[PDB]
Amino acid sequence: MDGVHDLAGVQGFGKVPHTVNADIGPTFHAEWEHLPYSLMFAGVAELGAFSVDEVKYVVERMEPRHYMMTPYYERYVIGVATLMVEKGILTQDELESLAGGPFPLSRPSESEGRPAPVETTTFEVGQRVRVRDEYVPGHIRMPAYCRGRVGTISHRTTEKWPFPDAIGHGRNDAGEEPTYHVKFAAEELFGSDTDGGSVVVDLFEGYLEPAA
Amino acid sequence: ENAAPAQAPVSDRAWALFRALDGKGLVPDGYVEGWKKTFEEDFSPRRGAELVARAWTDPEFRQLLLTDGTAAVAQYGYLGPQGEYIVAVEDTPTLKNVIVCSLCSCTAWPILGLPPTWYKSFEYRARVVREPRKVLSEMGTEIASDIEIRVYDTTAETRYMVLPQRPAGTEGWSQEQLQEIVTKDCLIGVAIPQVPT
Ligand SMILES: [Cl-]
Ligand SMILES: [Cl-]
Ligand SMILES: [Cl-]
Ligand SMILES: [Cl-]
Ligand SMILES: [Fe+3]
Ligand SMILES: [Mg+2]
Ligand SMILES: [Mg+2]
């Protein structure tokens, strides 16, 4: 999904709000901040109501201006709440009632997702690959800066996982794939407009094809 | 035009979500309190520092951590949520590694701790992929011009830690002494371990 969350490469942001080794304060800076994650785990591990990938997607589904003005942990409060309503566990009415006011949610999905690709290739370390020049409106674990670009395999995982583009929509057809550490030269991704060396993207096998 | 939606205070929303689920019997007793203690006390960059200090003083462990990071971490009992498949990336005299999650916040929680606010910032997520040298410089870390910067974007299940170079002036230090100088930021890759005088 080509949302505003796909931030890598966007220009115009200011300074990172940190200097190295500065005091970052406590883990949680407010007494509610442990709730989104804890409640995600309840939903994933105790209720079985959704996957972690569905959490990543529902946060991507925040209305874009809403995403851009919302602090990190609050996005996950909104996202977990949205999934609990979508799955029929909770109602928006009861959330608002208990909250004592408005509790806007992420927007509905505009895609049903897609299955794990039927045809893929096992790549080896040192192999040159291109990221498939595809557009996925639903969830995908491919940042757009690498779409259509070419790089070289430095690792194939020794474990396999469900295809995000499926399981992020709660589909039954996510299969399993390994992922690959794909090293791209900085210039392959940003031309002359980068100060970097290389960027390594951890990409599912279904996002890749042999290079030319 | 472009205004924020009306919203109740965030703490009211967050605790509404808790109480809605808790009041349906969906949240076991002590569940979110237990995860809060895990997040605060157990997931910690002290664990990644321990791993770096062992690698610096034990060539065999170093080799293990760089070839099968999951098994190396497992020896210490530090696998865990958002840190099940671990890859450690080695800094060298010509290579500086840095980790981000451009898409969200993905971090090796059990060994680095939960990410800091700044790591999840739009500024870091947008910029470090494209201009890591300038980002690091701004943050206080000058990377000499003879060093390739390599940014790992944490886009799937691999969870990374940087193995920084060991600084001169630490020869013969104990693992305790070495752990002390391997900070959270050194594990992320944005800081180089510092030796006092
Ligand atoms: Cl609170
Ligand atoms: Cl150019
Ligand atoms: Cl293919
Ligand atoms: Cl911070
Ligand atoms: Fe993330
Ligand atoms: Mg985009
Ligand atoms: Mg030495």
Curated annotation (Swiss-Prot), chain A:
The keyword Lipid metabolism is annotated on this UniProt entry: no
A Pfam family the protein falls into: NHase_beta_N
Gene Ontology molecular function: nitrile hydratase activity; transition metal ion binding
EC number(s) reported in the record: 4.2.1.84
Biotechnology section: Industrial production of acrylamide is now being developed using some of these enzymes.
UniProt catalytic activity: an aliphatic primary amide = an aliphatic nitrile + H2O
Family affiliation: Belongs to the nitrile hydratase subunit beta family.
Assembly mode: Heterodimer of an alpha and a beta chain.
Protein name per UniProt: Nitrile hydratase subunit beta
Source species of the chain: Rhodococcus erythropolis (Arthrobacter picolinophilus)
Gene: nthB
From Swiss-Prot, chain B:
Residues annotated with Cysteine sulfinic acid (-SO2H) modification: 104
Covalent S-S links between cysteines: none
Catalytic activity: an aliphatic primary amide = an aliphatic nitrile + H2O
Activity modulation comment: Inactivated by nitrosylation of the iron center in the dark and activated by photo-induced nitric oxide (NO) release. Inactivated by oxidation of Cys-106 to a sulfenic acid.
Origin: domain of life: Bacteria
One family name in Pfam for this protein: NHase_alpha
GO MF annotation list: nitrile hydratase activity; transition metal ion binding
Cysteine sulfenic acid (-SOH): residues carrying this PTM: 106
Subunit structure: Heterodimer of an alpha and a beta chain.
Family assignment from sequence similarity: Belongs to the nitrile hydratase subunit alpha family.
Name this protein carries in UniProt: Nitrile hydratase subunit alpha
Organism: Rhodococcus erythropolis (Arthrobacter picolinophilus)
